[PDB]
C-alpha cells in the first residue's frame, strides 16, 4: 500500500514501489447474441402518422440488418481476434448457430459446446425477435393496421435503439469496436459474465472491483448474422496474475553541468516504464500506454510485454551490477526538461535555462541548479521550466531522496558516444574500450614516428 | 493579416510569417454540478406499458448513477488533470460538497471558496433533483401510480438523455473526456461561462471568437457523485498571450543533384514547426498537432512548447548567424517528396523520379528539375510526384521566392555525416574538422610512410 518512491541522484531515476499488479494473460470469448426477426414484407395500408412512424422504425431496423449483413461480408473482421474470429467461422458451419439457438431458448445464459472442441458461454442480451413477432407483427398482419397507442411506438424505438447504436458502432469501426461500450454489453451484464466465467475467485473479485479497466481492455468482434441470430464475440480479458508486486521507473536526462555549449553529454536510462513480477520472471512494459494505473493496482497487458530474468530488479538499485546489463541512451541535446513522477518531479536544467518550484500560497520557493534534481510532492505544488509549466501530483506516500554521485561524471565527454537509441553498460564500456584502443593505436603510431 | 510566405532556396525552407497567435499558458476549472435524486425504492404496482416505460427510464437512471459511482471509485481519474484532481480531492472532504450545494440553491452560477484556498465558479447545468422529486416522485409515491401524460415520459427521457450520454462518455473514456462534448457543456453555457472568468477583455473576446478551439483544448474530469450532487471539473484553457507574432517553418530535404546512386547527401532542417513570441522569448512547437490554425490566427499549447532566445529568429533568415545554432538532420535517402506550405509547395526530386505541376484547366504546366524547388499557389493547383498526388492550398497572400545557393554544395559528401537526427551547424562544423583532423593525422601517416 505504501508507495515508497525512491529517487537516485546517481542516474537521477525515480523508481516507485509498493504497486500491486494484475497482469492480463488470457482472453475469454463470450458469444453475445441478439435474436433478430426475419421480416421483409409490409402488409400495412394505413396512412396514420403513428403507422408512418412504425414503418420508418421498421425501415431503420431493416437497414441496420442490411448493414450488419455487409459487415458479415466483411468478416472475418494478434490474439485479440485470432481467438475471436475462430468462433466466427465455427458459427458459420452448418448447425452451429442452431445449437446455440436451441440451447438459449430456455435460459438467457448458457454454456454451449461447439464443433471446435471449445465450450463458450452465450448470453442473450436482447430478444428483438420475440418483441417484433408478438407485438408489431400482429399489427402488420391485420389489414386495419391500428397501433394500440403511441407508447408502443416509443417502446419499439427504445428497444431498437440498442441495435441501431450497435450497428452504428460496427459500421464506423468495420466490426471491431474497442473499448466495449455500454451498448455492446451493459455493466450489469458484464458483471454477470464475470461471475459465470470459470476462474479463480480472486479473478472474479479483481474484475468486479475494476470494471472500467475491463471495458478499456475488452473487445467486441462482429461474428455472424444468420438464421434470425446476430452473434458478436465479446472477448473479455483474463487476469492470470493478481496482486503481484509491480514498480515503475521514470528516467530523466543526466547531462554535464558545464555552461559551455557542446561539452554536455546526456545519459538517460532507456529501461523506463513498468515492471511486474510473474512466475519468477519480470514482465517489462516498454511503453506506459498498456499499463493503466488505478489508485494502487497497475492493471497491465502482457500482449506487448517482454519477459526478463529476475535479477533485472537488482539493476534498479545497482546499475553497475554484473547480474543484469541495464539499458541507457547516450545523446547530446541538453534541453532542460521535467518528468512528473507519482510522488514528485525530476527536473533537469542545463545552459541558461531557468527552473523554479512554486507553491500555491508561498509562491515561488525554490530555484533549480544545473543537473537533474528531484522535488517531493508535499510543500511544492508547481514546477516551471523556461516558459512551460507542470505540476507535481499530490499523491500521498513516503518519498526518499538518495544522495548519488552523477554516473555521467565517470564518462569522459571526448570518448562518450552520441545519439545512441538504446545502449547497455556492457555495450557502452566495450565501445569505450574500442575507442581507447584506437587512441592507444594512435599513440603507437606517434611512437613509431620515432623508435625506427 | 497579410501572410508573407517566404521560400529560401539556400535551405529550400518555407517560412510563413504574419500570424496572430494566441498561446495558452494555464487553466480555469469550473465545477459543473448536476443535482441528482437519491431514489432507490419503487412503490409502484402498475402493469401499464407507460408505467413500464417510466420504470425502465428510472432503471436506466439508477444504472447511470451506479456507473458514475464506479467511476468515482476510479477517481482520482502534466497540468492536464492536476487542477481537476485537486478539486476532486477537495470535494471529497467533509462539508466541501455541502457548501457548493448550499451556495447554488438560489442561482445557477456562483463563485465559491473551498478549503484549499481557491475560489471557483460552480455552474449548475442540469437540475435533475427538482424534476425527479416534483414530477415523477409524487406519481411513484401514490398507490394509483397513474402517469397523467405521455409527454411527461418523453420529457423525462429528454432530461435524462444528457445524463445518460455523459455517463456513456465517462464510462468509455474512464472518467476523462476530451474534447468536451456538447453534453458536458453546451456552447451557450460555455460562452456564458467565459464572460464570468476573471480575465482581461481581450481573453474573453478571443475565446468568444474561436469557441471550437476552446473545446478542442478543453477537458472534463469526473470528480464526485455524492450527497445528491454529480460534480465534474471542466477545466477550460486560458490564453495569457493574444495576437503575438507567430510564424511557421516548413522544411524539405535538400540532396545532391548527382544522378549516380550513393553520392546524394540529404540535409533537412529539423527546427520545423511553429514559433511564437512570448515575454521576449520564442516559444517553439516542434510538432504541428498542438498548434491549430484558423484564419491566420494560430492557437498553441505551451505544455509541449520549448522556450528559446529571441535570436533564433535570425536563424530563419541566416542559418550561419553566430547568434543561434539551428537544428538540421543529415540523411542518405534521396526519395523525391513534396511538402505543402501555406502559399505554395516545396518539391524535391532526385534520381529518375519525375515531378509535374498542373492546373486543372491547362493540364500539366511545369516539370521539376533535380533538387528542391518551390511553386506558388496561384496558377498551379496540383503537384504529382512519381505516382502520388499533392495539392497546393488556395490561401491568398504574397509569396516571395528568394534565390539561394544550396547549402549542401559547401558540404563535401565524403566528410558529410549520415543518419543524424538533431544536429546543428555549430555541431556539424568540427566533426568534419575532426574528420579533416582524422585526415590530417592520416596525412601524417603517409608522411610517416614518406618521412618516417
Amino acid at each position, epitope marked *: 500500500q505504501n508507495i515508497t518512491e525512491e529517487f537516485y541522484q546517481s542516474t537521477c531515476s525515480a523508481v516507485s514501489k509498493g504497486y500491486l499488479g494484475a497482469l492480463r494473460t488470457g482472453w475469454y470469448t463470450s458469444v453475445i447474441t441478439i435474436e433478430l426477426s426475419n421480416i421483409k414484407k409490409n402488409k400495412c395500408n394505413g396512412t396514420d402518422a403513428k403507422i408512418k412512424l412504425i414503418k420508418q422504425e421498421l425501415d431503420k431496423y431493416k437497414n441496420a440488418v442490411t448493414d450488419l449483413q455487409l459487415l458479415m461480408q466483411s468478416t472475418p473482421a494478434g490474439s485479440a481476434i485470432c481467438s475471436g474470429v475462430a468462433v466466427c467461422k465455427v458459427l458459420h458451419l452448418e448447425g452451429e448457430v442452431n445449437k446455440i439457438k436451441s440451447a438459449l431458448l430456455s435460459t438467457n445464459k448458457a454454456v454451449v459446446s461447439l464443433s471446435n472442441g471449445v465450450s463458450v458461454l452465450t448470453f442473450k442480451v436482447l430478444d428483438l425477435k420475440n418483441y417484433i413477432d408478438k407485438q408489431l407483427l400482429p399489427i402488420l398482419n391485420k389489414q386495419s393496421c391500428s397501433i394500440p397507442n403511441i407508447e408502443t411506438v416509443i417502446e419499439f424505438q427504445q428497444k431498437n435503439n440498442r441495435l441501431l447504436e450497435i450497428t452504428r458502432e460496427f459500421s464506423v469501426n468495420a466490426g471491431v469496436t474497442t473499448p466495449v461500450s455500454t451498448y455492446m454489453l451493459t455493466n450489469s451484464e458484464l458483471l454477470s459474465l464475470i461471475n459465470d466465467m470459470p476462474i479463480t475467485n480472486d479473478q*472474479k473479485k479483481l474484475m468486479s472491483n475494476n470494471v472500467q479497466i475491463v471495458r478499456q481492455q475488452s473487445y467486441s468482434i462482429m461474428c455472424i448474422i444468420k438464421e434470425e441470430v446476430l452473434a458478436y464475440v465479446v472477448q473479455l480479458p483474463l487476469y*492470470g496474475v493478481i496482486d503481484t508486486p509491480c514498480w515503475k521507473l521514470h528516467t530523466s536526462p543526466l547531462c554535464t553541468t558545464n555552461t559551455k555549449e557542446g561539452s554536455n553529454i546526456c545519459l538517460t536510462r532507456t529501461d523506463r516504464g513498468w515492471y511486474c513480477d510473474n512466475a519468477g520472471s519480470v514482465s517489462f512494459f516498454p511503453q506506459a500506454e498498456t499499463c493503466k494505473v488505478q489508485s494502487n493496482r497497475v492493471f497491465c497487458d502482457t500482449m506487448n510485454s517482454r519477459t526478463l530474468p529476475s535479477e533485472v530488479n537488482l539493476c534498479n538499485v545497482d546499475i553497475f551490477n554484473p547480474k543484469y546489463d541495464c539499458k541507457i541512451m547516450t545523446s547530446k541535446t541538453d534541453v532542460s526538461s521535467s518528468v512528473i513522477t507519482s510522488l514528485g518531479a525530476i527536473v533537469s536544467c542545463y545552459g541558461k535555462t531557468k527552473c523554479t518550484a512554486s507553491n500555491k500560497n508561498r509562491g515561488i520557493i525554490k530555484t533549480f541548479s544545473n543537473g537533474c534534481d528531484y522535488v517531493s510532492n508535499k510543500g511544492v505544488d508547481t514546477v516551471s521550466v523556461g516558459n512551460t509549466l507542470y505540476c507535481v501530483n499530490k499523491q500521498e506516500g513516503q518519498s526518499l531522496y538518495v544522495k548519488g554521485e552523477p554516473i555521467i561524471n565517470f564518462y569522459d565527454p571526448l570518448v562518450f558516444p552520441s545519439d545512441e537509441f538504446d545502449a547497455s553498460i556492457s555495450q557502452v564500456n566495450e565501445k569505450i574500450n574500442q575507442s581507447l584502443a584506437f587512441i592507444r593505436k594512435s599513440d603507437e603510431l606517434l611512437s613509431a614516428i620515432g623508435g625506427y | 493579416q497579410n501572410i508573407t510566405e517566404e521560400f529560401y532556396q539556400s535551405t529550400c525552407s518555407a517560412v510563413s510569417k504574419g500570424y496572430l497567435g494566441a498561446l495558452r499558458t494555464g487553466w480555469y476549472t469550473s465545477v459543473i454540478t448536476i443535482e441528482l435524486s437519491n431514489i432507490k425504492k419503487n412503490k409502484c404496482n402498475g402493469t401499464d406499458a407507460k408505467i413500464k416505460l417510466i420504470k425502465q427510464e428510472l432503471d436506466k437512471y439508477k444504472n447511470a448513477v451506479t456507473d458514475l459511482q464506479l467511476l468515482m471509485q476510479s477517481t482520482p481519474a502534466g497540468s492536464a488533470i492536476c487542477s481537476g484532481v485537486a478539486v476532486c480531492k477537495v470535494l471529497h472532504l467533509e462539508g466541501e460538497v455541502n457548501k457548493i450545494k448550499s451556495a447554488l440553491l438560489s442561482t445557477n452560477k456562483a463563485v465559491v471558496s473551498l478549503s484549499n484556498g481557491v475560489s471557483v465558479l460552480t455552474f449548475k447545468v442540469l437540475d435533475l433533483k427538482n424534476y425527479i422529486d416534483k414530477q415523477l416522485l409524487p406519481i411513484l409515491n401514490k398507490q394509483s401510480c397513474s402517469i397523467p401524460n405521455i409527454e411527461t415520459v418523453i420529457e423525462f427521457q429528454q432530461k435524462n438523455n444528457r445524463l445518460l450520454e455523459i455517463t456513456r462518455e465517462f464510462s468509455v473514456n474512464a472518467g476523462v473526456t476530451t474534447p468536451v462534448s456538447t453534453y458536458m457543456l453546451t456552447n451557450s453555457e460555455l460562452l456564458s461561462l467565459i464572460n464570468d472568468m476573471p480575465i482581461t477583455n481581450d481573453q474573453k473576446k478571443l475565446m468568444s471568437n474561436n469557441v471550437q478551439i476552446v473545446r478542442q483544448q478543453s477537458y472534463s474530469i469526473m470528480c464526485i457523485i455524492k450527497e445528491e450532487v454529480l460534480a465534474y471539473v471542466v477545466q477550460l484553457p486560458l490564453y495569457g498571450v493574444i495576437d503575438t507574432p507567430c510564424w511557421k517553418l516548413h522544411t524539405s530535404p535538400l540532396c545532391t543533384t548527382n544522378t549516380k546512386e550513393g553520392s546524394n547527401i540529404c540535409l533537412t532542417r529539423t527546427d520545423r514547426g511553429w514559433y511564437c513570441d512570448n515575454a521576449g522569448s520564442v516559444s517553439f512547437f516542434p510538432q504541428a498537432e498542438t498548434c491549430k490554425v484558423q484564419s491566420n490566427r494560430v492557437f498553441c499549447d505551451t505544455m509541449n512548447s520549448r522556450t528559446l532566445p529571441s535570436e533564433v529568429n535570425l536563424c530563419n533568415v541566416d542559418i550561419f548567424n553566430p547568434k543561434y545554432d539551428c537544428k538540421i538532420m543529415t540523411s542518405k535517402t534521396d526519395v523525391s517528396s513534396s511538402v505543402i506550405t501555406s502559399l505554395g509547395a516545396i518539391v524535391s526530386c532526385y534520381g529518375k523520379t519525375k515531378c509535374t505541376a498542373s492546373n486543372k484547366n491547362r493540364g500539366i504546366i511545369k516539370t521539376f528539375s533535380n533538387g528542391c524547388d518551390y511553386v506558388s499557389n496561384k496558377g498551379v493547383d496540383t503537384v504529382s510526384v512519381g505516382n502520388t498526388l499533392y495539392c497546393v492550398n488556395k490561401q491568398e497572400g504574397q509569396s516571395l521566392y528568394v534565390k539561394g545557393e544550396p547549402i549542401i554544395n559547401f558540404y563535401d559528401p565524403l566528410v558529410f555525416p549520415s543518419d543524424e537526427f538533431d544536429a546543428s551547424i555549430s555541431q556539424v562544423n568540427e566533426k568534419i574538422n575532426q574528420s579533416l583532423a582524422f585526415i590530417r593525422k592520416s596525412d601524417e601517416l603517409l608522411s610517416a610512410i614518406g618521412g618516417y
Partner: antibody
Amino acid sequence: QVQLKQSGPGLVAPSQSLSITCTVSGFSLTNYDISWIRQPPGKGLEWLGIIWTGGGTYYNSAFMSRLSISKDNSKSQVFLEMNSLQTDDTAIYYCVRAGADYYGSSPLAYWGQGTLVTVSS
Amino acid sequence: DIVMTQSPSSLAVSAGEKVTMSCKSSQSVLNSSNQKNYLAWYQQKPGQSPKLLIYWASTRESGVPDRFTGSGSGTDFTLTISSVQAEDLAVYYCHQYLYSYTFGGGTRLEIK
C-alpha cells in the same frame, strides 16, 4: 480489536423475506470483504455469497435467484436478505470476513456472534 | 464446485494421544498465480462460532495453540494434533476457497 454485531430477526414464516444486518467495527468496510456463511443444525458450514470491497457481489449459484447482499461504507454496514425462505433453510448465519486479493490473509477469521434463523409459521 | 472429503466422520481418543484427520479435494487447489494452496482448517467448539486454525495447510492463525499443525500437498492434506486436550472437544472442518467456497462433513473428536 475488530468486531461484528448482527441485528435483525431470525424467525420468519415460510415463503417470506428474511433480512439481517452486520455492523462492523475496528476496520474499514472499503478494505475488507464480508462473506456470509450458513450452518444448518447438525451439519457443516456452507457458502451463501459474498460482497467485495467495490460493492459487487457473487451469490451462490443455488441462491442466486433469492439471495441479496448489499453494503454501505459510511456507516460500515452489510445487509443480507433472502426471499422465498422455506423450511429447509433453518440454520445459523455468520457475517464472516475475508482478506485481500493476495493469499496472505486470514480467510474466515472473525465470524459473527451467530444469528439463529428458524423458518416456521 | 470442488467437493471436500474429510475422514473420519468421528474420531474418539483419550487425552495425550495423537489424532490425524485427512481431507481430500476433488480438483487441485494449488494456485498458479501466487504458488499457494487455498485450504483452511477450522475448529468449532459446541455452541461457539468456528475459529480459524490453519490456512495454506501450514500457516496457523494468530493466537491458536501450536499443537495443531497439519501439512499436505496437491489434493491431499492432513491435520494432526500433537497433544490432545480435554477442552479441544470440537468439530473440525476443511475448507477450500479457490474456485468457490465449500466445506467438508466435520471430523468429531470425543475424549475418553
